[PDB]
Symmetry: D2
């Protein structure tokens, strides 16, 4: 029986997003300071050089 404006629903999520966003930004930094990468994270990196060095 509560009037829940769409605008008010939108809002709650925007928050849930920027929150969840700020968590990666921080988690990302934490992983750099440890020097950690996920299997995939490595594979992108390695390949990236391969390509661009192979360019000149």
């Amino acid at each position: 029986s509560i009037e829940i404006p769409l605008h008010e629903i939108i809002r709650k999520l925007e928050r849930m997003n920027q929150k969840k966003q700020a968590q990666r930004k921080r988690h990302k930094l934490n992983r750099k300071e440890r020097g950690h990468k996920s299997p995939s994270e490595q594979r992108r990196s390695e390949l990236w050089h391969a390509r661009q060095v192979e360019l000149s």
Copy 2:
């Protein structure tokens, strides 16, 4: 197993809302042109003049 960006869920509800807004705008106008009002839309109006008159 498709990924659903919150930024999208938002973008969607944003749409739902304007569509829902413009409806009213048209609808509200359509009413005025017939001169129709609701039982609720009456009390408020009547009560407003009465209040507004009871001021001057």
Copy 3:
């Protein structure tokens, strides 16, 4: 204070309504004998496959 439980429930109804909005709307096009360009293909493309089994 907006519990998630509500966002859910609010959206539930909305879907179930847009459901009937179609279910009715679909049935309505049938009594006219109207189809979409897309519905023609999906229809005439379908029989060809069935008239070929027996």
Copy 4:
């Protein structure tokens, strides 16, 4: 720019919630183990014992 079935948006929130729900459940059991309560929880508790010992 892909279509998003409202069933799936919902399907996401359901999940999301069932998480929130499950953290609180264990987080609650974590407190109970340390015997830690909240100011709110102190009243709620005490203010309940007096309405309990009296009214029966």
